C-alpha cells in the first residue's frame, strides 16, 4: 500500500533478516503466557514463532488467534526506525480503520508499538491488532511481532488475551 512498512525499511537498506525459532543460539528468550481458555500453537508456517488460539470460538473455522513472529535483523539497522514504521503494515490492510497510528508501549522492559483497528475481509468486519517489540541484542536487533485477529463480535476475547500478554510476558536477551 501507500504506507511505508518495516518490510520496506529492510528491503531498502543493507539489512539482513533471518527468521528466529525457539531455542536458536544467539536469540532472546521470550516467555509469552497462554491465557485461560486459549491453547498454544507450536511453531509452523502459519505461526512462525508459535501462537495461541481461542478454544471457544463462535466459528470453529475462524477462531480468535494471536500469532507471534520473531526476526533477527543485522547490518545497518536503527531500532527506533523499526518502531517508526510499525504502523504501516496494518494501515495498508483493506479498509483498515483504527485510532490513529497507534501508540508507544513496552513489553518485558523493551520498547514497543501497538496499534489496532478493524478491516473488512470478504465482506466481514474483523478486529486486528499488532504489537511490535524491538529487542537490541548480541550484535543484532530482534523484532517480535504479535499479530491478533478475530471477527468483530469476538473483539473483547482478543482484548482480554492481549491484557494477559502485556502483564506477564518476559523477554531475556
Ligand atoms: C498483544 C497482541 C497484539 C495486541 C492485541 C490487542 C488486541 C485487542 C484488540 C485491539 O486492541 O483492537 C482494539 C483497538 O482497535 C480499536 O478499533 C475500534 O475503534 C476504531 C475507532 O476508529 C473503529 O474504527 C474500529 O472499528 C473499532 O473496532 C481502536 O482503534 C484502538 O485504539 C483499540 O485499542
Amino acid at each position: 500500500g501507500p504506507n511505508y512498512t518495516i518490510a520496506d525499511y529492510i528491503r531498502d537498506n543493507h539489512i539482513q533478516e533471518t527468521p528466529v525459532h525457539h531455542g536458536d543460539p544467539g536469540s532472546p528468550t521470550i516467555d509469552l503466557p497462554v491465557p485461560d481458555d486459549w491453547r498454544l500453537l507450536p511453531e509452523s508456517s502459519r505461526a512462525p514463532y508459535g501462537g495461541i488460539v481461542y478454544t471457544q470460538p463462535a466459528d470453529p473455522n475462524d477462531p480468535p488467534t494471536i500469532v507471534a513472529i520473531l526476526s533477527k535483523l543485522t547490518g545497518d539497522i536503527d531500532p527506533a526506525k523499526v518502531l517508526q514504521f510499525a504502523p504501516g503494515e496494518l494501515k495498508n490492510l483493506p479498509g483498515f480503520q483504527g485510532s490513529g497510528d497507534g501508540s508507544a508501549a513496552t513489553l518485558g522492559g523493551f520498547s514497543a508499538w501497538q496499534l489496532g483497528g478493524s478491516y473488512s475481509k470478504n465482506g466481514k468486519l474483523r478486529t486486528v491488532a499488532q504489537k511490535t517489540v524491538v529487542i537490541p541484542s548480541q550484535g543484532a536487533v530482534f523484532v517480535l511481532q504479535l499479530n491478533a485477529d478475530a471477527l468483530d463480535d469476538e473483539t473483547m476475547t482478543l482484548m482480554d488475551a492481549a491484557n494477559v500478554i502485556d502483564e506477564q510476558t518476559t523477554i531475556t536477551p
Side-chain angles (χ1 to χ4, degrees), residues 66 97-99 114 116-118 127-131 146 148 158-159 162 165-166:
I66 307 177
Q97 56 192 337
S99 263
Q114 175 160 320
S118 295
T127 293
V128 61
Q130 179 181 68
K131 185 170 211 173
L146 306 178
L158 276 186
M159 300 184 80
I165 288 162
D166 295 357

Side-chain angles (χ1 to χ4, degrees), residues 66-67 96-100 102 107 114-119 125-132 145-149 152 155-163 165-166:
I66 307 177
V67 151
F96 186 72
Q97 56 192 337
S99 263
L107 195 59
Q114 175 160 320
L115 84 166
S118 295
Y119 80 114
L125 200 69
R126 314 190 59 89
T127 293
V128 61
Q130 179 181 68
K131 185 170 211 173
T132 299
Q145 295 197 297
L146 306 178
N147 295 325
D149 168 62
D152 179 68
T155 296
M156 299 305 290
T157 299
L158 276 186
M159 300 184 80
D160 292 324
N163 288 316
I165 288 162
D166 295 357

Side-chain angles (χ1 to χ4, degrees), residues 1-92:
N3 299 279
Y4 203 71
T5 69
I6 290 171
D8 294 328
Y9 170 60
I10 296 166
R11 191 195 62 241
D12 293 343
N13 293 273
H14 290 146
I15 298 171
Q16 185 184 263
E17 177 185 14
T18 295
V20 185
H21 308 107
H22 279 80
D24 278 1
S27 74
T29 307
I30 298 170
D31 185 13
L32 275 341
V34 180
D36 295 329
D37 294 327
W38 291 73
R39 166 168 68 77
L40 201 49
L41 303 176
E43 300 190 348
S44 75
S45 303
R46 253 217 65 205
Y49 200 73
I52 58 177
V53 60
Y54 191 57
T55 69
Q56 302 158 9
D59 183 348
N61 250 345
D62 194 4
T65 67
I66 307 177
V67 151
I69 311 166
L70 214 221
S71 304
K72 188 184 181 179
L73 308 190
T74 62
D76 191 15
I77 175 85
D78 172 356
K81 244 64 171 76
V82 175
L83 289 204
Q84 177 184 1
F85 301 129
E89 175 179 4
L90 295 217
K91 287 177 56 186
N92 293 339

